[PDB]
Amino acid sequence: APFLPFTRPEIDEETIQGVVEVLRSGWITTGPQCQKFEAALSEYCGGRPVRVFNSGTCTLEIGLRIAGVGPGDEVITTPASWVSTSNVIIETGATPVFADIDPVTRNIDLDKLEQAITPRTKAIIPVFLSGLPVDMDRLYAIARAHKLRVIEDAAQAFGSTWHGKRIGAIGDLVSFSFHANKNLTTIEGGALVLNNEDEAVLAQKYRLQGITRTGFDGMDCDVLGGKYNLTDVAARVGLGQLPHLERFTAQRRALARAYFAAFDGGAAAKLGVGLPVAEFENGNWHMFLVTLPLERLTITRAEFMAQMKERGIGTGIHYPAIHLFTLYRARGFKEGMFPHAERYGASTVTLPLFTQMTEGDVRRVVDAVNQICEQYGK
Amino acid sequence: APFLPFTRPEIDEETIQGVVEVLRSGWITTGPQCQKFEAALSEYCGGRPVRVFNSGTCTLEIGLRIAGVGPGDEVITTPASWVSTSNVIIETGATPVFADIDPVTRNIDLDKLEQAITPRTKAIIPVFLSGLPVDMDRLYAIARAHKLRVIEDAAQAFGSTWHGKRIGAIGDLVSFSFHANKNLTTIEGGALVLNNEDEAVLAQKYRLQGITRTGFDGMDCDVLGGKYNLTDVAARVGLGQLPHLERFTAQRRALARAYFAAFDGGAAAKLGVGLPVAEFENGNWHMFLVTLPLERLTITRAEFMAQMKERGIGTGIHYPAIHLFTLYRARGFKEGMFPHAERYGASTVTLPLFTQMTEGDVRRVVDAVNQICEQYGK
């Protein structure tokens, strides 16, 4: 059997031809394709202004800057996320504050978020882990009551909805990633959804060195911007992906259903492998995240992953707890501070989930997980 | 006649086919193409370690961080450059210090540079404007005598040499850009050349969030890194460009020679249009930069550029003086501080120069410049 990675993009020949056209045109960096992609994303978001960038990390940072976040301010987020989520807070000069996760959803616990608010809090970065939104009504009730800005880390949630409305069409500032591994890709890239045109102009300034050009020779810099513009090659890939979004999301929901059906009654389930929430309305099923019952295994997580690889199956880790990293320990974080995120971060494994998978592939994965639990379970 | 832009890339069919193969492979972000591109660049640089990035701006900032530059430190650079050159200094917390240009070369005046050294100076960022190196012997004599690090802003100078040695193979930390408009492109991208493998490891950490992965599930962050990795799509373009480097540089040299021959004795020269240095050994002729004699024209630079456009010729501005921008005026900079860079910044115009140009195109451009000077000269 061929090796089964945990993700793989699905890029059609029409999109590849589009990229060829862009390269042959000689107009290869930011240009008409980016304009078209911004317009398409804006219409997807119900007409809200959208600006595209070379990642879904800079979008977070720029969101914070638009919200006025800087030295002396606190921003609350989750430790169960990619480290950029809190590193961007540090980049602004602000102080990252963590709140623990709900062990069932693996997302930030909204009661713990509320409990972390102080007079210094200025913004919140919720993460939609696996593409699963939090309770968006509750999130914004908290933000409204405490007069906080929200920069949604929807990196994984392009195509997700909350009670029938799109992530991106609701809320405050919304950040998406189009990394290769995401449900829709531009190779690397991202987008920020704004509330109004003034915020979009500021976003544009931060995107490229704070520079505004006017006429043939007018130039000024009024903002300390960075280097964050997206190429037209990348934008063309995004434009080619968009018409497939609905189908991709449906495919991923079908695969997730197949996982639950396959796991039911097996050795892994019996041993205590922890499955994600079985819901098929809101999340876009970007990943299939399970937890190993470490106390009931005679092998480490690393060994478990090695055993999956021996069976030809790739796995990942999304994610170890941020606050236990060396840089964060130096800021004053320790074990015991976020027990749910710490248990999750030590035990989580990412199983294959991508649009070209078959039900057979799902059964192969579950077979391997069962076999390892049967052999090595206490 | 068709419109003549001031630049256009030259991307061949083998390269485009290569990008097609990368996309079909599903390995689209950082992977084996980036590894092969780093190896090729290392070879070009005489075996020095090289790391590639998503721009030639982050490479400058990372070079400063490797050099230990931060709050309280001064870094000397030129105001006649793209604003990222000094914005990266501010990003680190350090203080930018400007030194004026030599009006003949348009590069930083090394005596003015030396005059700007204080006990707070930690590093220098010379710019090789148009791809023209400074006197590299004098530059490093200064750096050694004052125990300063050098982060070369060689954005425009890939393929430039000094006394027959390659820019990149000499010097301290060397930063290149592979933007669409540069003599070799990766669509967008850059490279940093290091002195040793410890520097290269630090560069890698800064490249992607400070994260090191070990084994199946080991992960740590010990540095505040950013989001700066290059895609395999981009690296494949760079690999396809590299075999053309010598030919591209020769073509640009021949076009520059043709400009000098075409301008010689005409109305523009008589009025006072100022040409770049006529040397064909060191610089890679990335741009052909002229200065308008504004005191001898009845029209503005902007009107001069509009008149060129009426004649089907695109032009650019590289660059207005940085210290007169709003952000820099707020730091206390003002007119009269850098007279050569101010005069240059107000009067410079970029004429077409790219590998697919003909001798006829050069003559068309010069005809237009002569005609405008004849009409609007006083």
Give a three-class secondary structure readout of chain A: CCCECCCCCCCCHHHHHHHHHHHHHCCCCCCHHHHHHHHHHHHHCCCCCEEEECCCCHHHHHHHHHCCCCCCCEEEECCCCCCHHHHHHHHHCCEEEECCECCCCCCECHHHHHHCCCCCEEEECCECHHHCCCCHHHHHHHHHHCCCEEEEECCCCCCCEECCEEECCECCEEEEECCCCCCCCCCCCEEEECCCHHHHHHHHHHHECCEEEECCCEEEECCCCCECCCCHHHHHHHHHHHHHHHHHHHHHHHHHHHHHHHHCCCHHHHHCCECCCCCCCCCCCCCEEEECCHHHECCCHHHHHHHHHHCCECCECCCCCHHHCHHHHCCCCCCCCCHHHHHHHHHEEEECCCCCCCHHHHHHHHHHHHHHHHHHEC
Give the type of residue at A69.
Answer: V
* B138 and B220 belong to one structural domain: yes
* A311 and A179 belong to one structural domain: no
CATH number for the domain spanning A349: value is 3.90.1150.10
Whole-angstrom distance, CA of residue B156 vs CA of residue B78:
15
This entry's atomic model was obtained through X-ray
Q: Are A90 and B224 in contact (CB under 8 A)?
A: yes
Residue numbers in B near A309 (CB within 8 A) = 216
- Final residue in a domain of this structure, among B244, B276, B300: B244
Residues near A335 by Cβ (< 8 Å), separated by ≥ 6? Answer: A324, A342
Which two three-digit tokens encode residue A159?
């195509």
| Closest CA relative to residue B368, chosen from B287, B317, B311 | B311
Maximum Cα interatomic distance, chain A, rounded to a whole number of Å: 74
Inter-CA distances, B229 with A55, B267, B301, Å:
10, 49, 39
**CB spacing of A224 vs B26 below 8 angstroms:** no
Please provide the size of chain B in residues: 378
Q: Of B24, B54, B83, which is closest to A211 when you measure between CB atoms?
A: B83
* Positions of B marked catalytic: 182
Whole-angstrom distance, CA of residue B126 vs CA of residue B77:
6
Please provide the size of chain A in residues: 378
Give the type of residue at A265.
Answer: G
Residue A227 Rama label (left phi>0; alpha psi -120 to 50; beta) = beta
- Classify burial at B2, counting beta carbons within 10 Å of its beta carbon; exposed 0-12, middle 13-18, buried 19 or more: exposed
Whole-angstrom distance, CA of residue A106 vs CA of residue A129:
7
Whole-angstrom distance, CA of residue A293 vs CA of residue A269:
10
Whole-angstrom distance, CA of residue A33 vs CA of residue B180:
15
**CB spacing of A83 vs B209 below 8 angstroms:** yes
**CB spacing of B211 vs A83 below 8 angstroms:** yes
Whole-angstrom distance, CA of residue A366 vs CA of residue A268:
8
Chain centroid offset of residue A361 CA = 24
- Final residue in a domain of this structure, among B224, B244, B264: B244
Q: How many CB pairs under 8 A join A and B?
A: 158
- Classify burial at A281, counting beta carbons within 10 Å of its beta carbon; exposed 0-12, middle 13-18, buried 19 or more: exposed
Q: Are strands A173-177 and A95-98 parallel, antiparallel or unpaired?
A: unpaired
* B215 and B169 belong to one structural domain: yes
Measured from the Cβ of residue A106, the count of other Cβ atoms closer than 10 Å reads 24
Q: Are B254 and B204 in contact (CB under 8 A)?
A: no
Q: Of B28, B83, B180, which is closest to A180 when you measure between CB atoms?
A: B28
State the smallest CA–CA distance between residue A193 and chain B in angstroms. 20
* B219 and B352 belong to one structural domain: no
**CB spacing of B231 vs A317 below 8 angstroms:** no
Whole-angstrom distance, CA of residue B20 vs CA of residue B24:
6
Residue A227 bridge partners (DSSP):
A208
Whole-angstrom distance, CA of residue B366 vs CA of residue B374:
12
Tokens 């804006």: give the residue.
A42
Whole-angstrom distance, CA of residue B147 vs CA of residue B122:
8
Return the residue in A7, A91, A222, A227 with the most chain B beta carbons within 10 A, the one to mutate for interface testing.
A227
**CB spacing of B26 vs A16 below 8 angstroms:** no
| Closest CA relative to residue A240, chosen from A19, A2, A1 | A19
Whole-angstrom distance, CA of residue B373 vs CA of residue B298:
9
Q: Using only C-alpha atoms, what is the Rg of chain A?
A: 21
Nearest CA in chain A to B305: A216
* B227 and B301 belong to one structural domain: no
**CB spacing of A28 vs B187 below 8 angstroms:** yes
State the smallest CA–CA distance between residue B223 and chain A in angstroms. 6
Inter-CA distances, A160 with A60, A132, A134, A166, A246, Å:
18, 7, 11, 6, 10
Q: Are A50 and A38 in contact (CB under 8 A)?
A: yes
| Closest CA relative to residue B102, chosen from B140, B128, B137 | B128
Nearest CA in chain B to A346: B217
* B344 and B365 belong to one structural domain: yes
Whole-angstrom distance, CA of residue B125 vs CA of residue B151:
5
Range of the domain at A250: 245-378
Whole-angstrom distance, CA of residue A313 vs CA of residue B70:
45
- Counting Cα atoms < 13 Å in the Cβ hemisphere of B34 gives 20
Q: Are B152 and B172 in contact (CB under 8 A)?
A: yes
Q: Using only C-alpha atoms, what is the Rg of chain B?
A: 21
Return the residue in B22, B231, B351 with the most chain A beta carbons within 10 A, the one to mutate for interface testing.
B231
**CB spacing of A29 vs B187 below 8 angstroms:** yes
Whole-angstrom distance, CA of residue A164 vs CA of residue A135:
13
- The three state secondary structure string of chain B is CCCECCCCCCCCHHHHHHHHHHHHHCCCCCCHHHHHHHHHHHHHCCCCCEEEECCCCHHHHHHHHHCCCCCCCEEEECCCCCCHHHHHHHHHCCEEEECCECCCCCCECHHHHHHCCCCCEEEEECECHHHCCCCHHHHHHHHHHCCCEEEEECCCCCCCEECCEEECCECCEEEEECCCCCCCCCCCCEEEECCCHHHHHHHHHHHECCEEEECCCEEEECCCCCECCCCHHHHHHHHHHHHHHHHHHHHHHHHHHHHHHHHCCCHHHHHCCECCCCCCCCCCCCCEEEECCHHHECCCHHHHHHHHHHCCECCECCCCCHHHCHHHHCCCCCCCCCHHHHHHHHHEEEECCCCCCCHHHHHHHHHHHHHHHHHHEC
* B70 and B96 belong to one structural domain: yes
Whole-angstrom distance, CA of residue A151 vs CA of residue A67:
8
∠ at Cα B283 (B278, B288), nearest 5°?
60
**CB spacing of B227 vs A55 below 8 angstroms:** yes
Q: Which residues of B153-182 are buried (b: 16+ CB within 10 A; e: fewer)?
A: bbbbbbbbbbeeebbbebbbbbbbbbbbbb
Inter-CA distances, A166 with A43, A136, A138, B52, B66, Å:
11, 11, 16, 37, 43
∠ at Cα A345 (A342, A348), nearest 5°?
140
Whole-angstrom distance, CA of residue B277 vs CA of residue B283:
10
**CB spacing of A16 vs B29 below 8 angstroms:** no
CATH number for the domain spanning A42: value is 3.40.640.10
- Final residue in a domain of this structure, among B244, B262, B283: B244
* B319 and B375 belong to one structural domain: yes
Tokens 């492109």: give the residue.
B185
Which two three-digit tokens encode residue A173?
């500032």
Q: Are A160 and A133 in contact (CB under 8 A)?
A: yes
Tokens 């409305």: give the residue.
A165
Q: Of A188, A224, A327, which is closest to B327 when you measure between CB atoms?
A: A224
| Closest CA relative to residue B200, chosen from B189, B191, B209 | B191
**CB spacing of B87 vs A224 below 8 angstroms:** yes
Nearest CA in chain A to B224: A87
Whole-angstrom distance, CA of residue B144 vs CA of residue B133:
18
Q: Are A28 and A337 in contact (CB under 8 A)?
A: no
**CB spacing of A216 vs B82 below 8 angstroms:** no
Q: Of A15, A19, A29, which is closest to B188 when you measure between CB atoms?
A: A29
Whole-angstrom distance, CA of residue B82 vs CA of residue B84:
6
Residue B101 bridge partners (DSSP):
B108
Return the residue in B221, B236, B351 with the most chain A beta carbons within 10 A, the one to mutate for interface testing.
B221
Nearest CA in chain A to B303: A216
Whole-angstrom distance, CA of residue A286 vs CA of residue A249:
8
| Closest CA relative to residue A304, chosen from A354, A362, A348, A262 | A348
* A66 and A122 belong to one structural domain: yes
- Counting Cα atoms < 13 Å in the Cβ hemisphere of A278 gives 11
Tokens 């602004």: give the residue.
A92
Please report the sign of the dihedral spanned by the C-alpha atoms of residue A256, residue A257, residue A258, residue A259: positive
∠ at Cα A74 (A70, A79), nearest 5°?
120
State the smallest CA–CA distance between residue A165 and chain B in angstroms. 30
Measured from the Cβ of residue B102, the count of other Cβ atoms closer than 10 Å reads 18
- Counting Cα atoms < 13 Å in the Cβ hemisphere of B285 gives 27
State the smallest CA–CA distance between residue B145 and chain A in angstroms. 33
Nearest CA in chain A to B232: A187
Residues near B73 by Cβ (< 8 Å), separated by ≥ 6? Answer: B92, B94, B95, B120, B121, B122, B123
Residue numbers in A near B211 (CB within 8 A) = 83
Q: How many domains does chain A fold into? A: 2
Which member of A36, A112, A122, A182 is catalytic?
Answer: A182
Maximum Cα interatomic distance, chain B, rounded to a whole number of Å: 74
Q: Are strands A173-177 and A190-193 parallel, antiparallel or unpaired?
A: antiparallel
Residue numbers in A near B11 (CB within 8 A) = 23-24, 26, 28
Which two three-digit tokens encode residue B17?
């086919």
Residue numbers in A near B16 (CB within 8 A) = 20, 23-24
Residue B50 bridge partners (DSSP):
B193
Whole-angstrom distance, CA of residue A208 vs CA of residue A225:
6
Which two three-digit tokens encode residue A337?
């501070």
Whole-angstrom distance, CA of residue A28 vs CA of residue A230:
10
Q: Are A222 and B323 in contact (CB under 8 A)?
A: no
Which two three-digit tokens encode residue B373?
């000077």
Nearest CA in chain A to B215: A302
Whole-angstrom distance, CA of residue B106 vs CA of residue B104:
6
Residue numbers in B near A301 (CB within 8 A) = 216-217
| Closest CA relative to residue B226, chosen from B126, B127, B327, B91 | B91
Tokens 């987008």: give the residue.
A191
Nearest CA in chain A to B331: A222
* A21 and A125 belong to one structural domain: yes
State the smallest CA–CA distance between residue B277 and chain A in angstroms. 23
Give the type of residue at A141.
Answer: A
Whole-angstrom distance, CA of residue B100 vs CA of residue B231:
37
Whole-angstrom distance, CA of residue B37 vs CA of residue B75:
30
Q: Of A29, A315, A327, which is closest to B210 when you measure between CB atoms?
A: A327
Residue numbers in B near A209 (CB within 8 A) = 57, 82-84, 87
Measured from the Cβ of residue B183, the count of other Cβ atoms closer than 10 Å reads 30
Torsion of CA B291, B294, B297, B303, to 10 degrees: 80
Q: Which residues of B221-235 are buried (b: 16+ CB within 10 A; e: fewer)?
A: bebebbbbbbbbbbb
| Closest CA relative to residue B216, chosen from A314, A34, A10 | A314
The resolution in Å comes to 1.6
Q: Are strands B161-162 and B165-166 parallel, antiparallel or unpaired?
A: antiparallel
* A296 and A276 belong to one structural domain: yes
* B338 and B231 belong to one structural domain: no
Q: Are B217 and A301 in contact (CB under 8 A)?
A: yes
**CB spacing of B180 vs A306 below 8 angstroms:** no
Whole-angstrom distance, CA of residue A153 vs CA of residue A59:
9
Whole-angstrom distance, CA of residue B107 vs CA of residue A333:
48
Give the type of residue at A111.
Answer: D
**CB spacing of A180 vs B29 below 8 angstroms:** yes
- Classify burial at A72, counting beta carbons within 10 Å of its beta carbon; exposed 0-12, middle 13-18, buried 19 or more: exposed
Q: Are A141 and A165 in contact (CB under 8 A)?
A: no
State the smallest CA–CA distance between residue A145 and chain B in angstroms. 33
Q: Are A322 and A85 in contact (CB under 8 A)?
A: yes
Q: Are B190 and B175 in contact (CB under 8 A)?
A: yes
**CB spacing of B9 vs A29 below 8 angstroms:** no
Q: Are A139 and A162 in contact (CB under 8 A)?
A: no
Residues near B160 by Cβ (< 8 Å), separated by ≥ 6? Answer: B128, B131, B132, B133, B154, B166, B167, B282, B283, B284
Whole-angstrom distance, CA of residue B280 vs CA of residue B36:
31
